[PDB]
Short mmCIF file of C-alpha atoms in Angstrom, two decimals:
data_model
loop_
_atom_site.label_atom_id
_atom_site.label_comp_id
_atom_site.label_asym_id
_atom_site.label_seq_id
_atom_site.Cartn_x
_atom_site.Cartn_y
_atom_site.Cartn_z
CA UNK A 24 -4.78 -5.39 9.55
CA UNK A 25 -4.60 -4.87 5.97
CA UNK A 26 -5.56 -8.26 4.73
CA UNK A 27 -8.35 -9.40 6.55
CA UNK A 28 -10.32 -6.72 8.88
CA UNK A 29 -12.84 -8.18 11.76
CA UNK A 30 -16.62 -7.75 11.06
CA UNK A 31 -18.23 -4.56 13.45
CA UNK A 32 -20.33 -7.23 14.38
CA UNK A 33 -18.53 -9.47 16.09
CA UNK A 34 -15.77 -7.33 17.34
CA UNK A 35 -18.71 -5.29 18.57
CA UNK A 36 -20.10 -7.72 21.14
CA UNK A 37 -16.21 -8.94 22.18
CA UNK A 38 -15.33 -5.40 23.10
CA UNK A 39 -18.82 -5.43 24.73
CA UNK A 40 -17.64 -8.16 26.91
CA UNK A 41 -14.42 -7.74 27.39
CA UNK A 42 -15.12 -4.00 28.33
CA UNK A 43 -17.78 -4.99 30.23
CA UNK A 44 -15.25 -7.51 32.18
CA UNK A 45 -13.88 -4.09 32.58
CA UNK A 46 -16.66 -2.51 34.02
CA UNK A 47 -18.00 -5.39 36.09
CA UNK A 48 -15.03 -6.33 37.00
CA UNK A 49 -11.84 -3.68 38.42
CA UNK A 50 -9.98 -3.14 35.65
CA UNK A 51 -8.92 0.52 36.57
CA UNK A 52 -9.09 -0.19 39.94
CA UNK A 53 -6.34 -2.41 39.47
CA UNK A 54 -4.20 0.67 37.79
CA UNK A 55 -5.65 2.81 40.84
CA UNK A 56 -3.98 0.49 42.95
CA UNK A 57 -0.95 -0.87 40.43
CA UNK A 58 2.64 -0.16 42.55
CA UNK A 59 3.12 3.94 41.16
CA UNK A 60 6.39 3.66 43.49
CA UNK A 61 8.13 2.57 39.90
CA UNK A 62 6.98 5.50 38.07
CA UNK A 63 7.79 7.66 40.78
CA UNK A 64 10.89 5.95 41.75
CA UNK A 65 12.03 5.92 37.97
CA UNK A 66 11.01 9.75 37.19
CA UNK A 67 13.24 11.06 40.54
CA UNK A 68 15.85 8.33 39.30
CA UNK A 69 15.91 10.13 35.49
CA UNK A 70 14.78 12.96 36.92
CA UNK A 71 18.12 13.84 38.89
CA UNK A 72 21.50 13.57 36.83
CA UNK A 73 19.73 15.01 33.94
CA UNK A 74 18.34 18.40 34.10
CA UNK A 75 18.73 20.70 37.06
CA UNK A 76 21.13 18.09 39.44
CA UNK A 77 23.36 16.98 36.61
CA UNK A 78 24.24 20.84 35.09
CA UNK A 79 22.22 22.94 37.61
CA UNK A 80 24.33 25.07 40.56
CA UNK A 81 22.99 24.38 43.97
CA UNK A 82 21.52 21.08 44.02
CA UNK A 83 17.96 20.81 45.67
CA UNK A 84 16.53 18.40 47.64
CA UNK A 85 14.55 15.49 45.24
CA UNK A 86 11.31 14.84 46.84
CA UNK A 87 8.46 13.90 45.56
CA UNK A 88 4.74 11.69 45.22
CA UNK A 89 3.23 9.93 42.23
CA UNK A 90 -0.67 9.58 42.08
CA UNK A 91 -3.25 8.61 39.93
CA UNK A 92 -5.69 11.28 38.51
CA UNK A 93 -7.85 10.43 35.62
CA UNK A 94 -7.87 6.92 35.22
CA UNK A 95 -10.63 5.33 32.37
CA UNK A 96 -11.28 3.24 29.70
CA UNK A 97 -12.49 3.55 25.96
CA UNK A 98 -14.23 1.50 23.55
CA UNK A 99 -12.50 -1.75 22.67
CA UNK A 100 -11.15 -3.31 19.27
CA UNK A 101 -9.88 -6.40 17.73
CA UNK A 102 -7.78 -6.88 14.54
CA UNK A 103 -6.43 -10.35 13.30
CA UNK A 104 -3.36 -11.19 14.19
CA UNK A 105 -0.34 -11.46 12.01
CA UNK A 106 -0.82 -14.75 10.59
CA UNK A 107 0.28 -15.93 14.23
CA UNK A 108 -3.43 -18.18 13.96
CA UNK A 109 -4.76 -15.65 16.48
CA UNK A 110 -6.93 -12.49 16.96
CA UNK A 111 -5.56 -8.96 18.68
CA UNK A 112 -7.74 -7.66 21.47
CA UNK A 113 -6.92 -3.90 21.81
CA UNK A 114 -8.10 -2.54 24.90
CA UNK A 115 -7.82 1.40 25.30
CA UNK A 116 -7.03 3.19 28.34
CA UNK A 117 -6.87 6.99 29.26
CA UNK A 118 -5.23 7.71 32.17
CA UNK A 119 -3.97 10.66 34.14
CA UNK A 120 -1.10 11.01 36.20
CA UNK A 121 0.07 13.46 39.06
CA UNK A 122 3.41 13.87 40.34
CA UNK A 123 4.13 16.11 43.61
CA UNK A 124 7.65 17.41 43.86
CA UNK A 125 8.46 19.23 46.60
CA UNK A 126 9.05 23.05 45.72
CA UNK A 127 8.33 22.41 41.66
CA UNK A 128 5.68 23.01 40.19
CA UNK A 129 3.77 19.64 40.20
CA UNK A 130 2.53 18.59 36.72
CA UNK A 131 -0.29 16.11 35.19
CA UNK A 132 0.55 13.37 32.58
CA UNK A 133 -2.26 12.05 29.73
CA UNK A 134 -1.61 8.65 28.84
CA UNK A 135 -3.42 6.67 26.16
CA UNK A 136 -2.65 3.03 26.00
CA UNK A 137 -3.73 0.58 24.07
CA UNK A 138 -3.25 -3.10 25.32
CA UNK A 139 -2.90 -6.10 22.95
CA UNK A 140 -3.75 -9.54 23.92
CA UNK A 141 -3.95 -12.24 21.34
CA UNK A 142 -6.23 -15.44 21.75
CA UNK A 143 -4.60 -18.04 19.49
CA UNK A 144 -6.39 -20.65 18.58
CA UNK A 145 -6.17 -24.18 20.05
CA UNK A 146 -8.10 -27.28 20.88
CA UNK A 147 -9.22 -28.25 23.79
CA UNK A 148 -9.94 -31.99 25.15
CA UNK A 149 -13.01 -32.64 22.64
CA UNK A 150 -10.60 -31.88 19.84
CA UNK A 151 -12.43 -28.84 20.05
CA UNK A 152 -11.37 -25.19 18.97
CA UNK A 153 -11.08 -22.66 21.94
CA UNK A 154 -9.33 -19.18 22.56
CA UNK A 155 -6.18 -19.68 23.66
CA UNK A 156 -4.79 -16.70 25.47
CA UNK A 157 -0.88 -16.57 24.77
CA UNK A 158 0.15 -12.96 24.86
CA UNK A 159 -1.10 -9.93 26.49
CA UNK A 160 1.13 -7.06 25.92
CA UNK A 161 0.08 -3.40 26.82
CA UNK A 162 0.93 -0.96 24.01
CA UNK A 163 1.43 2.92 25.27
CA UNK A 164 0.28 4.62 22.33
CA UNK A 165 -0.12 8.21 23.36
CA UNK A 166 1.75 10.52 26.41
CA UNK A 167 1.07 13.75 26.47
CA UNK A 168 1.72 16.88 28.60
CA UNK A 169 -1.48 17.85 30.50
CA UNK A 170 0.11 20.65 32.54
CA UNK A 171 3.90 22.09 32.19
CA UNK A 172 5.16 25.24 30.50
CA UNK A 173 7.34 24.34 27.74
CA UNK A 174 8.78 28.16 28.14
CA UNK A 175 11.25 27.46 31.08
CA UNK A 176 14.15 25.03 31.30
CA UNK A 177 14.38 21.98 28.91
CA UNK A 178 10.46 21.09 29.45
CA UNK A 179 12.18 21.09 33.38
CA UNK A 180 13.07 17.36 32.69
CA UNK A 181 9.70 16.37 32.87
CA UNK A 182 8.88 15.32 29.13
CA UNK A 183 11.38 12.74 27.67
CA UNK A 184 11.76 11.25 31.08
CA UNK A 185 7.84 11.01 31.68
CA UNK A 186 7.02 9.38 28.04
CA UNK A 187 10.32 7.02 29.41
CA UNK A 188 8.84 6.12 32.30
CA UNK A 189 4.76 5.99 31.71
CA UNK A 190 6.29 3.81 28.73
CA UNK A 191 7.72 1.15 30.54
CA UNK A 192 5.00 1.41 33.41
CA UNK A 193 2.14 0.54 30.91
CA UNK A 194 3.94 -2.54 29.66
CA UNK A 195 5.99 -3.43 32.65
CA UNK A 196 3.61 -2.23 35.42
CA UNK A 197 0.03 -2.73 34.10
CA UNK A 198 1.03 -5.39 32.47
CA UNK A 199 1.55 -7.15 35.77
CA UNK A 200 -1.38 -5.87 37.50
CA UNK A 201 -4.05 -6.11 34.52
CA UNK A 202 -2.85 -8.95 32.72
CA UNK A 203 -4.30 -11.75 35.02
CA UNK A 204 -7.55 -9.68 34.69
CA UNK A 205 -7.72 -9.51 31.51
CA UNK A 206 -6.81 -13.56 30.92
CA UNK A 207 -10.29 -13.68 32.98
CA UNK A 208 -12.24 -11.64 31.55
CA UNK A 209 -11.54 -13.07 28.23
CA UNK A 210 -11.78 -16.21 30.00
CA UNK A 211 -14.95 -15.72 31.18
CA UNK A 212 -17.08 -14.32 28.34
CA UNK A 213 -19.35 -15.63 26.09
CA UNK A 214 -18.88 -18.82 24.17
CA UNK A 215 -20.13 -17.13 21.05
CA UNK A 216 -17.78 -14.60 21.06
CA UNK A 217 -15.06 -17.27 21.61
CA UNK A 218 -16.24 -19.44 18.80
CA UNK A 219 -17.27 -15.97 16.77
CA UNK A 220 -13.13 -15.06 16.88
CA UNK A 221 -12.51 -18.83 16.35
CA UNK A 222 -14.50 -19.12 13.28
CA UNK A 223 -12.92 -15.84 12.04
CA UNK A 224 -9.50 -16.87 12.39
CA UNK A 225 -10.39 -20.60 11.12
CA UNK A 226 -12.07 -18.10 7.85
CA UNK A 227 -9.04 -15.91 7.88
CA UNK A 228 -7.08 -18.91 7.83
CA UNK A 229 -8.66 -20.78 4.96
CA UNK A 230 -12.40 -20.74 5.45
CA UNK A 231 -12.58 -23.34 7.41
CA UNK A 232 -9.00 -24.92 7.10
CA UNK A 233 -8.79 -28.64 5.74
CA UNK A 234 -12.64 -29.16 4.96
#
């Protein structure tokens, strides 16, 4: 956002709403319980035929669990979109995650997401102008190593193929499991924030557009 920024203001009380659609609501609950047999399933897939099973003498046996540690949510922002008529909702996330291999040492992944849903303006039946939610894509901004000693074998394949995978399971997997919650909560806030974003876009747009 380097043309037009959104006023504290306003953005203020949206992420207020939309985080507290969050809170109220189950938004990391929903990660909590999002399908980690992807991650998991991806990671053991990388995993082996990379490090230690694709140049490593005696192969060992690939077992291993994916959990959930430290699952939470920041404080919200919005931007304007790109000229796409529309406003960016950027909702932060900090999550932890655990994997459990058998005899290896088991290590803890940070990630920091930030999702991006636009509401694109529309109007409704009474020629009216509402939010019209058309994309909701979840941004991974930030992996990074909680626990694992870089002093061993190539970070023991557990770097590269982590950022891979928590990569893809932020936009792929939480973006299945969170998107239909947050295409409520957005759904279901106020009608001044709605008209607030409206208004902004309609300003960012050209005032008012076609006074």
């Amino acid at each position: 956002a380097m043309a037009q920024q959104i006023p504290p203001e306003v953005s203020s009380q949206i992420t207020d709403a939309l985080t507290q659609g969050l809170l109220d609501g189950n938004f990391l609950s929903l990660l909590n319980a999002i399908n980690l047999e992807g991650l998991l399933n991806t990671i053991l897939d990388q995993v082996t035929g990379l490090l230690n099973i694709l140049v490593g003498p005696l192969l060992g046996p690939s077992d291993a669990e994916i959990k959930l540690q430290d699952t939470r949510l920041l404080q919200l922002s919005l931007e304007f979109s790109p000229d796409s008529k529309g406003i960016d909702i950027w909702i932060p996330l900090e999550l932890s995650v655990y994997l459990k291999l058998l005899i290896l040492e088991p290590l803890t992944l940070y990630v920091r997401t930030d999702i991006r849903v636009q509401l694109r303006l529309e109007s409704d039946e009474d020629g009216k102008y509402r939010l019209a939610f058309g994309h909701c894509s979840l941004l991974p901004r930030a992996i990074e190593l909680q626990s694992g000693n870089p002093l061993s074998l190539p970070v023991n394949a557990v770097l590269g193929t982590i950022e891979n995978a928590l990569g893809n399971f932020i936009t792929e997997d939480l973006g299945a499991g969170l998107c239909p919650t947050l295409n409520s909560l957005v759904s279901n806030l106020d009608l001044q924030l709605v008209n607030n974003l409206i208004n902004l876009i309609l300003d960012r747009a050209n005032v008012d557009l076609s006074v």
